[PDB]
């Protein structure tokens, strides 16, 4: 639970690099919702966002997938 905002965002950019992010997604806004998250939890938000997409037979991940993932992993 040590990575700061920029450190969190960097973890998000790294793991989203190969995902098919929908046009206009905002990873910084996702980082802002994660104060106090461990680096692993940030990674989890990426993978969990992907799972929400697959669950809906979607190859493209949306801001909502990410939003829902954050609440899932931390809440």
UniProtKB/Swiss-Prot annotation:
Family from the record: Belongs to the AAA ATPase family.
Protein name as annotated: 26S proteasome regulatory subunit 8
Places the protein is found: Cytoplasm; Nucleus
Role summary: Component of the 26S proteasome, a multiprotein complex involved in the ATP-dependent degradation of ubiquitinated proteins. This complex plays a key role in the maintenance of protein homeostasis by removing misfolded or damaged proteins, which could impair cellular functions, and by removing proteins whose functions are no longer required. Therefore, the proteasome participates in numerous cellular processes, including cell cycle progression, apoptosis, or DNA damage repair.
Assembly and oligomerization: Component of the 19S proteasome regulatory particle complex. The 26S proteasome consists of a 20S core particle (CP) and two 19S regulatory subunits (RP). The regulatory particle is made of a lid composed of 9 subunits, a base containing 6 ATPases including PSMC5 and few additional components. Component of a complex with USP49 and RUVBL1. Interacts with PRPF19. Interacts with TRIM5. Interacts with NDC80. Interacts with PAAF1. Interacts, in vitro, with the thyroid hormone receptor (in a thyroid hormone T3-dependent manner) and with retinoid X receptor (RXR). Interacts with ERCC6.
Lineage summary: Eukaryota, Metazoa, Chordata, Craniata, Vertebrata
């Amino acid at each position: 639970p040590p990575p700061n905002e920029e450190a969190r965002l960097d973890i998000l950019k790294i793991h989203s690099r190969k995902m098919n992010l929908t046009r206009g997604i905002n990873l910084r806004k996702i980082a802002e919702l994660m104060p106090g998250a461990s680096g692993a939890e940030v990674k989890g938000v990426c993978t969990e966002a992907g799972m929400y997409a697959l669950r809906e037979r979607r190859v493209h991940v949306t801001q909502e997938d990410f939003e829902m993932a954050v609440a899932k992993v931390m809440q």
